[PDB]
């Protein structure tokens, strides 16, 4: 029974964990996408060339 | 022969008696211990849940 409850904590906490990492990955990637959409191709072009 | 076998038989049967009372007593005490651990881990599993 302790193994069972342990499976409950495991599945729940793992799901919340993956959801957190996913949502943070979302805000991060959306942030970087906002950056490249903002400063534009030519700015990173300036940094590169 | 009868003397030494008699005393050795007495001490040996004494050990057998102690082993038997220890036996059944271990059985019952292990059983009550089983119910105790059962109810304790049950309520514990509940509140922890």
Curated annotation (Swiss-Prot), chain B:
Name the cystine pairs: none
Q: Where in the cell is it found?
A: Cytoplasm; Nucleus
Return the protein name: Major vault protein
In terms of domain of life, where is this protein from?
Answer: Eukaryota
As for what it does, the entry says: Required for normal vault structure. Vaults are multi-subunit structures that may act as scaffolds for proteins involved in signal transduction. Vaults may also play a role in nucleo-cytoplasmic transport. Down-regulates IFNG-mediated STAT1 signaling and subsequent activation of JAK. Down-regulates SRC activity and signaling through MAP kinases.
Mind telling me how this protein is modified after translation?
A: Phosphorylated on Tyr residues after EGF stimulation. Dephosphorylated by PTPN11.
Q: What taxonomic lineage is listed for the species of origin?
A: Eukaryota, Metazoa, Chordata, Craniata, Vertebrata
What residues of the intact protein does this structure contain?
715 to 763 of 861
Q: What is known of its domains?
A: MVP 3 mediates interaction with PTEN.
Under the subunit heading, UniProt states: The vault ribonucleoprotein particle is a huge (400 A x 670 A) cage structure of 12.9 MDa. It consists of a dimer of half-vaults, with each half-vault comprising 39 identical major vault protein (MVP) chains, PARP4 and one or more vault RNAs (vRNAs). Interacts with TEP1. Interacts with PTEN and activated MAPK1. The phosphorylated protein interacts with the SH2 domains of PTPN11 and SRC. Interacts with APEX1. May interact with ZNF540.
């Amino acid at each position: 029974k302790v193994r069972e409850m342990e499976l409950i904590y495991a599945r729940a906490q793992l799901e919340l964990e993956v959801s957190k990492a996913q949502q943070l990955a979302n805000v991060e990637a959306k942030k970087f996408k906002e950056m490249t959409e903002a400063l534009g191709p030519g700015t990173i072009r300036d940094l590169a060339v | 022969a009868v003397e030494s076998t008699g005393n050795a038989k007495a001490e040996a049967e004494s050990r057998a008696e102690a082993a038997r009372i220890e036996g059944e007593g271990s059985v019952l005490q292990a059983k009550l211990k089983a119910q105790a651990l059962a109810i304790e881990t049950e309520a514990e599993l509940e509140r922890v849940k």
